[PDB]
Amino acid sequence: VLSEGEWQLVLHVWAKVEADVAGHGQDIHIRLWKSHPETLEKHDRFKHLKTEAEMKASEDLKKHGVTVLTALGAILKKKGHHEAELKPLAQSHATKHKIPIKYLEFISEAIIHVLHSRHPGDFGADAQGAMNKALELFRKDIAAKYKELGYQG
């Protein structure tokens, strides 16, 4: 569990994300796919995007990033009290999309990279550690739900 101070650092940087959710979501996807191209294979639509400029020009991808960050933001704002929000996400990611926990590690890395790239003055070592803990809690709780659903992930 995170301390109150750690949650405040998480939500402080999250407020910066909320100034441009769409742009952050695009950058996170592009960073994830560049670092781990196998993840781009899970999007039947997005996997045919060939260049960074094509990725930025995709309204579908931009909309998807807002959907992703809206879901993650709603979870983070619960400060760990997120079972109701997390359960449907685990259901779809385990049973329909088949997303292994390691891919959630990859997107967590991309999130931290983009947040530090855009907001270094609000995302130093302490805030990075807090965000790392919050995303680790998210992944640990998702992994438990995966197992409950019969998916080892």
Nearest approach, Cβ of residue 66 and ligand HEM (Å): 10
Say which amino acid occupies 118. R
Residue with tokens 């949650």: 7
Stretch 23-82 residues interacting with ligand HEM (CB under 6 A): 39, 42-43, 64, 67-68, 71-72
**Nearer to ligand HEM (CB atom), residue 2 or residue 107:** 107
Stretch 79-138 residues interacting with ligand HEM (CB under 6 A): 89, 92-93, 97, 99, 103-104, 107
Nearest Cα neighbor of 70 from 112, 17, 109 is 17
3-state helix, strand, coil split of the chain in percent (to 5) is 80, 0, 20
Residue with tokens 């197992």: 147
Nearest approach, Cβ of residue 65 and ligand HEM (Å): 10
Q: For residue 93, say whether it is annotated as part of any ligand binding site.
A: yes
Nearest approach, Cβ of residue 25 and ligand HEM (Å): 10
Q: For residue 64, say whether it is annotated as part of any ligand binding site.
A: yes
Given a contact cutoff of 8 angstroms between Cβ atoms, the answer to whether 101 and 143 are in contact is yes
Instruction: Please classify residue 132 by burial: count the beta carbons closer than 10 Å to its beta carbon, then call 0-12 exposed, 13-18 middle and 19+ buried.
Output: middle
**Nearer to ligand HEM (CB atom), residue 64 or residue 77:** 64
Residues found near ligand HEM in the complex (CB under 6 A): 39, 42-43, 64, 67-68, 71-72, 89, 92-93, 97, 99, 103-104, 107
